Symmetry: D2
Subunit: 485 residues, 4 copies
């Protein structure tokens, strides 16, 4: 597998001719992303990202493409890869290679290695490409990460270099894990210091999602986190809006494109009642479904009950569920035994960041027979029961794999948060240690205020007197630091 | 254009190689259609529609497909066309032509004349092929109608034969009227008794939608109805389930796939607040939208206000709406003047039965320019203001044109009523006059029951004494004839 | 018992010092009842009800009071009684007796026999008083009824006078019914033609409720309906607004005041999914409850499931329900045996029309022990299991019994329909048979329209061309007769 | 005003004869307060609060009553006053002076100073009495506060005692404050070190609400806090359940008891969108209102618009509001000009904590004329407009003033938190500096888990693999410290 090179830009993507359709959709999205568009304006002269060489690992969609070009508009060079084998929107990847003023013959964009429907092998080669900058003396100096695959490939790659060996894999490590070690192994026979030099070049990572953030926290606790990290997931305008309201949008979109099943009247089981399970549950309720929820956290569970949902175990409920969704960020939610419990033609999906929430390995080793219905939609049949289950996206985040992930207006929040964090970490890199940070609240309020005004909400201004009363500035921050919204 | 013929089946569809993707989706819809399936079991042996030659004008979807193979399992012969230029699912057409145990080379299915993306001429061409059976000793004896196009063809085309002349079209009649007349005048040069003979052959029409039904009420008021009609729309289990809950599902699917625009937080205007617009509003509200409603009927309008919606006019509302949807079954709802007042990149669509709810004709002759984004998605730009509008399906039903229309389970309600009404008019024909009828209430409760059962709902049975107290039989009907549910 | 008398008016009402509080709440009511206000004005000069002598049998509330001063503003003579033992608001009883301009010592009002907390004996007495006009030779000529208690009395009163024998109550008959016959038999010592001569005098009845309406369909089915009747319940502005939305408001109010129990997070069982049951589910859902539903009718049951509720039997869900509400208008819903299976401190109430939805008689006779908490709130304990149930209003309609029933604005619909139908039967006698009737659509639309306007809803006007397209008048009704809204 | 004394217990309350009624409601509340009952078991053997003498300043409700008796099952001595002049539930205060085994002639309860409908002099007399313990060797050694009126009385009284003067108050000042200074000055004459000696034995304060916590932060910022305090408002189980789901219950209760107004279809303005405003809006939306919101915080304003609500200013929306509710915790939300702008018979209320959210000062000084309707309901007429406005509770927390405040199940949470906070600041007094503290997450989770259990929800148990996967103990806590739910 070798990159394609066209006008001095290396890339690997499905179809460059898709760039014109891409570009139309990016222009509509610009109008739905006032967060990115307002940062392109405010920061257009300052070029705060000059010198940045951002390796981005993030679903290669239309919304991402507007983030990329926000980042280039602000002075950075970028190289991109998807953080998921089914997340890439192919017209969008074409539109990024091509750039606003390029064509397929004369592209004027950025390196992108991503298409919809990678193999695990293809997936990890692209991430490597995304991370390996052309000039050996100018490696990546910034990571923009979603789920921490880029971060993991750098930190563990350096780890196994410093140790002088990449270890082999156990016959039953995840496939995903075998592939990853294999790439690391192969490159170690040829280049014995690649990741070490990258890890040393990288000045910061910015991390977009819960799963990724947890992995950061587990690196920093191991003493093994080699550069500053901003936790972008836990900006208020990210977690409470993307994880929740985005999912309220894109969960039923994904189930729609994949199955066209009526949601109304059906029994629905939502595993997890974090931000994501919250949107899931509220999306499904809005559509007339009968929803129960699973949880391990008593606080989130009591929220569910108060919100009208039975709190049940997978054990007691799975046999009656017409549609099952995992939304935990944990492993081993729906096992093979749970899948064999499900009613004929029930639907099973994962909206959590990785495929191990459902036991897809054990379903693949089970002896069930698989009939592909269409892309990312599989009928599985169990000989002993004669029942068949519809599985979405091979147990990968179904909203990005069966549809288009969250909408632009929502990613504007997330990506505005990300753009700020890239700017912050790059311009003020010396004011951070190798720990995990969150953005100051006044920046989150900046991010929300943009979207209120765009939507046409009218915020009230505190009087002199009211601000002293609440003990705040008329211009914020307006809430204590531990405030929960 | 010329029909294809494989194995003694005339037809004209996009692509026969789509048979297999069709058949897979058909077997999945059958599990979601217990109403059709129950009717297949109940009536297999009775072959109640033997000798019926059914001509069908109804959106050629996966769901319509399971209806067709229900009429054939019941003993009918059918010929099919879609009743819309954008609603055909091409894989479902392919499968209906091929049949359950046909192949694309040796089809063993039914004539179909429909593909997604027909021009107006090929629509009426298609429509005529469907009503024209081979062997003039055996024309169509049953119409299955949605919209009234098949019935309008047969009944105007008769009345133009009796007047000895097809009329000219005036300077500015709908293109669709001009193409419609074009088809009849051309036919009248070669065949002056064709529609008279076909109308004389038709034992009954069954009509599926409010628009259709109203046109039936108009033929019968003028004294032109040539055969009995069943109004299928007005079954309680069609109107209150399909029109309302189907739309609640299919409206947002249509908008999602066309635009991917966030719904949450947007101002939304639904025009009309009957069953269709009740569904729209419900669906929009459940996604976190700020909904307003227009109406002419104060009863329907008081209902909206009681549901949390502002009742407003287009005029007060139009310039602020982020999304505007017409659900009225009437014409002239969003006029060019309204379109010009819309905000930059607002989304406009029609979910009623035809394209004149929005002023498309006015749009096209206005001097705004069009840029196609993708199929059934158009950006129109007003150079004077600089503001663009995204139009959906060229103003035609957006859920069928931009997505897939209602889900199988819902259609199972409307298609069971279809099948039952075909059976009643075929088997008890002598029992009807040239009038519009509605099905007994016991049959409506029969269709509701199949679906309660299928969803796991448990009906409570009346005691003898309870049933006496209510003055109903333990088995129903349970409500007086004027009951509104 | 003996009537009071001041300034010409016989009454019997809790306490007269309460005209002040009453009058206040009554002028607040007036502002929330434009349907009544509009009617007071329109027919002000005209006095449509001149000579009419009206015997109202309907919950003596602050809304009934504004309906009464409407009927007198239109030129009628009224005699009032509550149609329920707990539903009277004693400050409104007081204000009607006293009048808009009077004193407790100098009452310018009208005759009212009712107070909160009647005995079956006092109730039926006060009913007899109400339907007992003082003068000749000029008795009751109009019954305004609710539940049909007035009409039963009169019609069976006559029925027994004709047969000679007032029959002796059987032992398994309710106490309500034993009292009823007692009352008749006593009057059938002294008077010998009381009820015959009242039945002859009565020109017609207007019946407010579903249960009353069924009793009228049963009477007319016998051939023993003695005069014309209007089914007021079955007006759209009545049934689809009062039964549904007023219950949505007044169910949770009854429960709050009775018990103050957290609704959010509780499992709740609604028996019945008609208009009432629909309003209960909605209210309970909106507060966060986990709602299930029971039904006999598969159409109503498919609606509940489509609206996100399990459809279940009492049997399967009784044992888990924190709150159980009957909304059926039938008998024998929650039997003693179901009460015994209930969880400790579960709440139980009836919102239908009488107290035999819940098997109260079976409870009283069973050996549970009643502890009164306060008026209309009883704790019942089963000593064998040790579990207690909170019973509301002794199983009488809990919303009028534990609170204030439906709000003014809602009642403004039902009562507008009541006044209009009192005008129609009074002014237009000769045009009605001894059959049950419903008001015409434009009168339904008229009521809805006043209310839409009052809430600030702006209806659209059909253009002349729109109206010919839909086959309706710009003004006249918009829907066919069988339209279900 | 002097304290009554029966059987050695000083108190001042409405009617001691209300004890029987109270005690019934208390024992029902115990079945709905598993949090409080679970601690009574866990700890009445331990006796953790032995020697605590708790001066509590907390609405004197049935719910607060079950808390008082929790604290006394755990060893505490208590003295109580209500923190609001209308928030007293007279019967519950009677029930608490009486005790579980007492009668009105032989009370066995605790001292209580509260009655619904105190004056301002009376209000602060009671607080004096609640803080003033009989033994002066043994003064109050703990405080349970709700709005910091007790904490301000003890620290603001002590600043004036170190200062050798109570300053005077000007004609322009808040009315409650002159009163507040009249008390500290009157006492200062006869007693010079009262609050100094009190400020010095108090081992710690537990603060229950937002406003009380702002004022606490205002004290500890100036180095003026003399003891270790606990912010109990900002326990997840309090803020996210009480303020939100508690208010969703008690807002509409209050408005219903005060007005009987249809909420459905009315334009409602909610001022603020924290927890309180959140619950307000959800409750009003559930009831079919058309809700708009006002905010000064861009994040909460965005959350609002994502939930379906316009985000408006008071100035732009107030002429149209049918019902106005303030929920900010801020002064000067609705001024006299705004109240003068309201339509006639619109309703206005505060649900914040103090009464200055509405400009009740200006309104009483406006020259507007007041009719009282019933307790806590006033009609204010403006002679210039002829417009009257219904104000609830004279602008004081309308949930507690017009009804009964939050339900027991909900208060069960806020109070298991206070209970635990009390136990901690008392048993483990050494660990806390003189700063504002929050409970650890493992205790919040404890509270939530008792209630999940009580409701019948089944929590899932992490396996060991998963707990490792997530980096948590199987036993919790499950979330990062900054996690917002
Ligand atoms: N698909 C998307 O568009 C999208 C968007 C945002 C986040 N995500 C991903 O979704 C996942 C959930 O994120 P979140 O923000 O909701 O995190 P969260 O931590 O707010 O919520 C997760 C919840 O799952 C629960 N949980 C853990 N193990 C469980 C088990 N065995 N059973 C039931 N519940 C369990 C926890 O108690 C918690 O409340 C993350 O992996 C995140 O990366 C995906
Ligand atoms: N009545 C009750 O039973 C009850 C229950 C809990 C809390 N409270 C009280 O309610 C009030 C709010 O509590 P909370 O937890 O919601 O606090 P919060 O901080 O969560 O919410 C208050 C919100 O109102 C906003 N606000 C401030 N000034 C404003 C203005 N001028 N206009 C519009 N919005 C403005 C702030 O942006 C904030 O988001 C407090 O005083 C609290 O003590 C009452
Ligand atoms: N506040 C109120 N006043 C009068 C009648 C009311 C009421 N609330 C409910 N009702 C009526 O009670 C009837 C039950 O007999 C319902 O049809 C409803 O119309």
């Amino acid at each position: 597998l070798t990159p394609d090179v066209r006008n001095g830009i290396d890339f690997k993507i499905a179809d460059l001719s898709l760039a014109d359709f891409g570009r139309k959709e990016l222009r509509i999205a610009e109008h739905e992303m006032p967060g990115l568009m307002s940062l392109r304006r405010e920061y257009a002269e300052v070029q705060p990202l000059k010198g940045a060489r951002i390796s981005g690992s993030l679903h290669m969609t239309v919304q991402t493409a507007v983030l990329i070009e926000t980042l280039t508009a602000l002075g950075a060079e970028v190289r991109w890869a998807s953080c998921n084998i089914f997340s890439t929107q192919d017209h969008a990847a074409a539109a990024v290679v091509v750039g606003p003023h390029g064509t397929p013959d004369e592209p004027k964009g950025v390196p992108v290695f991503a298409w919809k429907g990678e193999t695990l092998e293809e997936y990890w080669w692209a991430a490597e490409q995304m991370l390996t900058w052309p000039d050996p003396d100018k490696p990546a100096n910034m990571i923009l990460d979603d789920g921490g695959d880029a971060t993991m490939l750098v930190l563990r790659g350096m780890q196994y270099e410093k140790a002088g060996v990449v270890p082999p894999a156990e016959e039953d490590d995840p496939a995903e894990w075998k592939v990853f070690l294999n790439l690391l192994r192969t490159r170690f026979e040829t280049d014995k210091d690649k990741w070490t030099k990258i890890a040393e070049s990288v000045k910061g990572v910015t991390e977009e999602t819960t799963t990724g953030v947890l992995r950061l926290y587990q690196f920093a606790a191991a003493g093994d986190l080699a550069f500053p990290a901003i936790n972008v997931n836990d900006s208020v305008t990210k977690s409470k809006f993307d994880n929740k309201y985005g999912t309220r949008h894109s969960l039923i979109d994904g189930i729609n494109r994949g199955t066209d099943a009526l949601i109304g009247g059906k029994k629905v089981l939502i595993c997890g009642y974090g931000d994501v399970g919250k949107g899931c549950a509220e999306a499904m309720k809005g559509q007339g479904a009968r929803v129960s929820v699973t949880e391990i956290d008593p606080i989130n569970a009591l929220q569910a009950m108060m919100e009208g949902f039975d709190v049940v175990t997978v054990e007691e409920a799975i046999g009656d569920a017409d549609i099952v969704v995992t939304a935990t960020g944990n492993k081993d939610i729906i096992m093979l035994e749970h899948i064999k419990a499900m009613k004929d033609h029930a639907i099973l999906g994962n909206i959590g960041h990785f495929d191990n929430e459902i036991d897809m390995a054990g379903l693949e080793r089970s002896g069930a027979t698989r009939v592909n219905v269409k892309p990312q939609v599989d009928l599985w049949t169990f000989g002993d029961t004669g029942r068949s289950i519809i599985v979405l996206s091979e147990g990968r985040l179904l909203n990005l794999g069966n549809a288009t992930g969250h909408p632009s207006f929502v990613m504007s929040n997330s990506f505005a948060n990300q753009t700020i964090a890239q700017i912050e970490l790059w311009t003020k890199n010396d004011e951070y240690d190798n720990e995990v940070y969150r953005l100051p609240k006044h920046l989150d309020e900046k991010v929300a205020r943009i979207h209120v005004e765009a939507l046409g909400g009218h915020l009230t201004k505190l009087t002199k007197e009211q601000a002293e009363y609440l003990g705040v500035d008329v211009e914020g921050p307006y809430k204590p630091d531990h405030y929960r919204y």
